[PDB]
RNA sequence: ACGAGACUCUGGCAUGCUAACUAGUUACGCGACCCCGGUCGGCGUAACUUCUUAGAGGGACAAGUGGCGUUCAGCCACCCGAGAUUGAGCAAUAACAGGUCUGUGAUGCCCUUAGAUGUCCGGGGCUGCACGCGCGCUACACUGACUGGCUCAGCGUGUGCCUACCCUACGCCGGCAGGCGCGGGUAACCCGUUGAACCCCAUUCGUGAUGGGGAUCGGGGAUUGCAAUUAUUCCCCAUGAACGAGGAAUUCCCAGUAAGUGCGGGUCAUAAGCUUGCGUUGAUUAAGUCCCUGCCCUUUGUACACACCGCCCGU
């Protein structure tokens, strides 16, 4: 019952930039929520990062809602 | 042109029921597939009738739970919609698949029954009708992606999508299939 | 920082633990094995007595430990079935005297831990299994075979490095087994 | 126990009067598919239909009373 | 720009009280006591300061600029019906307080209803609800 | 013979009947915009009841089929079918020491009647707080909060006798609460096609008593009234407490139902956290039982009958 309480960082130090940037177009599933629980960053700035990552095409849009959006990896052939 | 009903994109046949006991219960095949997971109704008014909705339409009615969500279809829709997506891409496997084998996976098979006065503990094992095993696997997996998908930073997009696959696999990290294993030990400790 | 207390993952059937109570439910109710991890189990209702109780909180007492018996168990799924009413009244000394043993041993080495830095579920798990678990597999008891062995190695300096963990390391666990057990 | 009894399952004939204490169970009429001339008497908790099939886990008890 | 800038400040000293760098600037500047969520929209649309960046990369002339809109708003073309303290009872101005006029002029405010012992002011000293409420049912935590 | 039933109102349909410039539809002309064809709740007038209004008649009756039943009353499933159990109204004999003398110029008796328990004026009180209890409202969040845009109803009510106090389109001023000259309606004509809310879409927020929650409290400005202080009410900026899904126990309900969500009426000079209606979105579970709390009938038992909340024995 360890309750460890999270401090999110509000913006990339050097790890997390290379780090998301090496793993994140390696998953299957990528959201905002998922992207926060990994690196442990904000939701916004998963946001901002998938929306860079997005801008760059390394990303293909899936589907779009004010509520969540669905992100996928490219096809590695 | 109708060639085929496909539940927004994705299709209704080519479709795999394992248990035979959940055949004539679950209405997914051929005949109860619509476009949406929305119907008009007239579907609880006799005993059996709700045997006859489709499986998908029923997991909509019983997503809304608890005051504040009660008759907001289209958010419920909505997220059975975006919840497909996330199955769709996450394992390679149709999502109606996945729904049925859960489901199957998921239904408690035996039940104790309290007997006796106010306040005595006596149970008695039963077996569960196969209607009532549909019933409580589509309550215990709303419950679970409900209570995954509170105070938490994933949605409950997400949070329901986790929750079928962990049912489906049989992992039994899933709440639905914990709920289900110890009511089958409770029915099994005293029969 | 925080593992289980001996080297077994889950314990055997028919095996008496302390177990710390969480949460009342319908079916059951909602333990906490403190000596096994945290890992979640399970109480029955008929089971908590042996006669007729008047209130689910006269033997409920949410917070505080309990002595509970082993009945079934799963090692490939996670789950423990705890037994109330089989337990003889000889037994709970000795599972308090276990369990002080096991809380001291533990503190001392989480104690040892913290100096000495070391912060990693896999290395923390090696540093038991450096200095707890292998006089435990020596002395072929869990919990019996530490307890004597500190005792021992608190005047025997040379049975107390025969392990070969580290050098600082050991000095410290020297150390703290000097100041504490006395 | 230490014996994995297999799972047999049973195709109802003729559903009797609703048994229990709040009236909840329900005495049923199974038979089985192995060998189609055995027919014992189970109780059921839901609503069941004629020619409804139901999953045993065992195939050995018979059924009792509201009590 | 997404990667953290050098001489990122973290803790913000500002007016004597704590203020953290890793909330949004419309927000981080409302810890300060006497200012809120609705006035500081209006200090970062007087100053040219966006409000799409945080608390905590803004530097010394930006943050001295919106210090300069605290003390002194009315210049800055801050219309008077916005102010949470005007035509005051002492000399008749219209200000806005920052923790220290606003907790000191409060204090002041409490001891002239007591000296002038009106029935506020007696409410007050008494330690009850002063806006004309039933007391009967509701305040079960006045005291022991 | 009463009660139940029978009866009435409302909903569910009828492209058949009667009818509509205080309701529209379809065609025709003119006008406006665009690329030859689309939109107009723009303007005007040749048929019509498909929408709307409301009148008369019709339609569902266990009517058919297959079973169960003494094959009698009736029950079950299915087909054709808008419905094969819609909701309300009225509601018998007998009595309650049930409530109302503060609804009445309905009322017996008693008290009082000029230093009045009649009446009137002015002020206060019914709101006062160690505490306990009931009905309710808002929340404890990410099925969410804020900000923009898109977009859909039905019951209603409205210038009153002494009685003065109505509902409102439109123009300007002001952030807003609000203010002035202007027009309609004594009402299917005017508010009004009642551009309602929940929902839908797109940003901001990211598990932090936080941008949740808005209690408490300070300053200022308008409206009603002869008069607001013990803030009538509304608006603006600050102040940002408890509260992390709630113990023993307990309430309501089974289909357009619970629940979420807003709009009318009653009180009303100023006025809804209450109540009565209305509309939108819209489920989980069940077609059973007498275990709990009770009710109806028959039999039996009784030392009860102001009736078990009864009666009764002894220190």
């Known amino acids: 019952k360890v309750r460890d309480k999270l401090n999110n960082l509000v913006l990339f130090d050097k790890a997390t930039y290379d780090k998301l940037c090496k793993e994140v177009p390696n998953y299957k599933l990528i959201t905002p929520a998922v992207v926060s629980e990994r690196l442990k960053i904000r939701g916004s700035l998963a946001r901002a990062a998938l929306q860079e990552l997005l801008s760059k095409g390394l990303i293909k849009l899936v589907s779009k809602h004010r509520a969540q959006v669905i992100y996928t990896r490219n096809t590695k052939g | ?191 | 920082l925080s593992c289980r207390f001996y080297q077994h993952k889950f314990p055997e059937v028919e095996d008496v633990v302390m177990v710390n109570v969480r949460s009342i439910a319908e079916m059951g109710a909602y333990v906490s094995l403190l000596e096994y991890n945290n890992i979640e189990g399970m109480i029955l209702l008929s089971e908590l007595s042996r006669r007729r109780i008047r209130s689910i909180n006269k033997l409920i007492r949410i917070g505080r430990n309990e002595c509970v018996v082993v009945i079934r168990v799963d090692k490939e799924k996670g789950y423990i079935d705890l037994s109330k009413r089989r337990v003889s009244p000889e037994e709970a000394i000795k599972c308090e005297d276990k369990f002080t043993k096991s809380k001291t041993v533990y503190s001392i080495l989480r104690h040892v831990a913290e100096v000495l830095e070391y912060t990693k579920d896999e290395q923390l798990e090696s540093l038991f299994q450096r200095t707890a678990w292998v006089f435990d597999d020596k002395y072929k008891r869990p919990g019996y075979g530490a307890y004597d062995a500190f005792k021992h190695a608190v005047s025997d300096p040379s049975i107390l490095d025969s392990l070969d963990l580290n050098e600082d390391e050991r000095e410290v666990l020297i150390n703290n087994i000097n100041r504490r057990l006395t | 126990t230490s014996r994995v009894q297999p799972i047999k399952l049973a195709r109802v004939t003729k559903v009797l009067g609703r048994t229990g204490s709040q009236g909840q169970c329900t005495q049923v009429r199974v038979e089985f598919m192995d060998d189609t001339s055995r027919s014992i008497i189970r109780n059921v908790k839901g609503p069941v239909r004629e020619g409804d099939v139901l999953t045993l886990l065992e195939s050995e008890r018979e059924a009792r009373r509201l009590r | ?144």
């Open chain 2, 1 to 191: 042109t109708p060639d085929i009903k496909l539940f927004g994109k994705w299709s209704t046949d080519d479709v795999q029921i394992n248990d035979i006991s959940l055949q004539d219960y679950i209405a997914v095949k051929e005949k109860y597939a619509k476009y949406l997971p929305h119907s008009a109704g007239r579907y609880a008014a006799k005993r059996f009738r709700k045997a006859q909705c489709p499986i998908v339409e029923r997991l909509t009615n019983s997503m809304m739970m608890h005051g504040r969500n009660n008759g907001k279809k289209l958010m419920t829709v909505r997220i059975v919609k975006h919840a497909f997506e996330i199955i769709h891409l996450l394992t390679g496997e149709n999502p109606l698949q996945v729904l049925v084998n859960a489901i199957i996976n998921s239904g408690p098979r035996e039940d104790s029954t309290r007997i006796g006065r106010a306040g005595t503990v006596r149970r008695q094992a039963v077996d569960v009708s196969p209607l009532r095993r549909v019933n409580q696997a589509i309550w215990l997996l709303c419950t679970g992606a409900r209570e995954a998908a509170f105070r938490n930073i994933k949605t409950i997009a997400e949070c329901l999508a986790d929750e079928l696959i962990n049912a489906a696999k049989g992992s039994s990290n899933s709440y639905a299939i914990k709920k289900k294993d110890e009511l089958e030990r409770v029915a099994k400790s005293n029969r």
């Open chain 5, 1 to 144: 720009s997404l990667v953290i800038p050098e001489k990122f400040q973290h803790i913000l000293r500002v007016l004597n009280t704590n203020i953290d760098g890793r909330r949004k600037i419309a927000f981080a500047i409302t810890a300060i006591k006497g200012v809120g969520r609705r006035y500081a929209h209006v200090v970062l649309r007087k100053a040219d300061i966006d409000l799409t960046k945080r608390a905590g990369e803004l530097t010394e002339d930006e943050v001295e600029r919106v210090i300069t809109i605290m003390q002194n708003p009315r210049q800055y073309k801050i219309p008077d019906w916005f102010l949470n303290r005007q035509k005051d009872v002492k000399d008749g101005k219209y200000s806005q307080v920052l923790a220290n006029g606003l907790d000191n002029k409060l204090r002041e405010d409490l001891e002239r209803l007591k000296k002038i012992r009106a029935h506020r002011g007696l409410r007050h000293f008494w330690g009850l609800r002063v806006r004309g409420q039933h007391t009967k049912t509701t305040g079960r935590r006045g005291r022991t």
